[PDB]
Amino acid sequence: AETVESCLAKSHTENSFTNVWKDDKTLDRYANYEGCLWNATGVVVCTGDETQCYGTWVPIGLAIPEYGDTPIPGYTYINPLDGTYPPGTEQNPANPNPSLEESQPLNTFMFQNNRFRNRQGALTVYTGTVTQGTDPVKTYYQYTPVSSKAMYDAYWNGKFRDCAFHSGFNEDIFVCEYQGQSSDLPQPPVNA
């Protein structure tokens, strides 16, 4: 059995984990292994379906409730809230306060399982929900301004022409053809 302390004391694991989850608020990557919860750090490379990621996994606490054995192709993960292009600054003038939407906006696009909104070049990313009010309680969909230079670079270089410019009353879950810089992950995942 494990405790928060036994887990925190484990050494990092540089390998691939499967059943990888993405925290909806921070967009960080997590996985369970050996009864502990781990966070992917360092250069993180994931499969297209985003279910497996290779990285320097750090145990941060207790766990929260077929594969080959050869390296497979993946894409280098970009956390769109990494702070390299911080909003509310001269560098990135975008208002830093997240946009609260009463209904999911139309024409969002998927890039590495992250849901983005493009408003004339200003990129915002879905970061879950928040509520305002108690009578009545009203849930809002939070769209946080993108703070990653890597994400904006891909956008500026035209990498999202096929997915970031849709218009109209669309029900499509647009998925971008470009999924990140190509790399590979070792196999099999250790927490299979």
Side-chain angles (χ1 to χ4, degrees), residues 12-15 17 38-44 54-59:
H12 68 204
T13 296
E14 290 189 28
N15 218 323
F17 282 35
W38 307 67
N39 170 226
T41 75
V43 179
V44 177
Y54 165 84
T56 297
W57 295 89
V58 174

Side-chain angles (χ1 to χ4, degrees), residues 105-110 115-117 143 163 172-174:
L106 312 163
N107 302 303
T108 59
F109 52 96
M110 310 301 293
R115 188 173 186 171
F116 301 85
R117 179 186 82 205
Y143 275 80
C163 62
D172 322 32
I173 38 170
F174 297 110

Side-chain angles (χ1 to χ4, degrees), residues 22-28 77-83 87 94-101 104-105 108-119 122-129 141-148 151-152:
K22 179 158 61 63
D23 186 297
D24 79 329
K25 288 290 167 190
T26 61
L27 308 183
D28 275 46
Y77 185 63
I78 293 170
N79 185 311
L81 301 174
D82 70 27
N95 191 311
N97 176 234
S99 304
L100 305 183
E101 310 296 330
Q104 279 284 202
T108 59
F109 52 96
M110 310 301 293
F111 171 68
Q112 309 188 326
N113 281 204
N114 278 313
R115 188 173 186 171
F116 301 85
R117 179 186 82 205
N118 177 18
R119 297 176 79 179
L123 307 176
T124 222
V125 63
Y126 183 48
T127 51
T129 68
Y141 300 99
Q142 189 178 243
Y143 275 80
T144 302
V146 166
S147 66
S148 171
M151 185 60 187
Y152 268 100

Side-chain angles (χ1 to χ4, degrees), residues 124-139:
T124 222
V125 63
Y126 183 48
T127 51
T129 68
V130 300
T131 63
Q132 293 179 315
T134 192
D135 188 353
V137 178
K138 193 165 182 186
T139 301

